[PDB]
Chain A
Amino acid sequence: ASVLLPQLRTGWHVDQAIVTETKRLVVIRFGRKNDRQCMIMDELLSSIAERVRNFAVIYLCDIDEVSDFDEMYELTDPMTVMFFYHNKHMMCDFGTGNNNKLNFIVDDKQEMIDILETIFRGARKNKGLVVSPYDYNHKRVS
C-alpha cells in the first residue's frame, strides 16, 4: 500500500474524490495507518484495487489530518471502510449489526472482490441497502 493506493490528504480531497466519480464506485477507507488492523486492509486493497479498477476504486484516508468526517459518520474505530456511489453513502448489510460501515478485516481477495461486486450491483440497481453474500456474524462483530 501507499504506492498504488492514492492517499487523500484532507477533507477536501475526500469530498472532491467522492463527488468526481459518477461511473466508478468510490471506496474510501479511514484508519490510523500505523495500526495492524487497518494496515492489513491496506495491503489487501492494493491487489483488490488492481482487480476492481475497471469498476470500483480505492482511496486511503487516515484520521490524522482529517477529524471532519468522524463527527459526521460516527467514526472512532481501529479502522473503517466507507462506500459511496453517485455521491451517496452505500449501506452494506453484514452480520455485524452495523449496516453503514464495515470495521472488520477480510482475508480473502476473491471475497473482497465479491462484496465490492455486490454493493456495485445494488448500487446500480439504486437500492440503498444491498445484502452481502456472506455473513460475518461470528467472524469479528467488533
Chain B
Amino acid sequence: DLKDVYASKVRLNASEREELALIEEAYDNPHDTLNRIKKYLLTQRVFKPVDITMMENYQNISPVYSVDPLEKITDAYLDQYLWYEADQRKLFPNWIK
C-alpha cells in the first residue's frame, strides 16, 4: 500500500527515495522491521512533526498530512492489522460504508 504511489514515477526525489528505502529494508528484514513496529506501538508517545502540503481541488482545499516515512510504516501495519481484526470480528456493522 505504501509502494502503490511509487510504482508510477520514473524519477524519485529525495524524500520518496528515503521512504522507498525504508520499505525495501522492510522487505529485506521483516523480523527486524516487525520488531521495530511492535516497539513503537508499545512505547513511543512522542513523535516527529508533520509537514503539510495542501490538496487543492479548486472546490475546496486541505489537508495533506505528510508523515515521516519511518512512522508511516508503523501506521500502515497498524492500520492493516486493525482492519483485518476488526473485519474478522465484525466490529463494524453492515450498514457502515
Given a CB threshold of 8 Å, the question of whether A touches B is answered with no
Q: Which residues of B contact A (CB under 8 A)?
A: none
Q: Which residues of A contact B (CB under 8 A)?
A: none
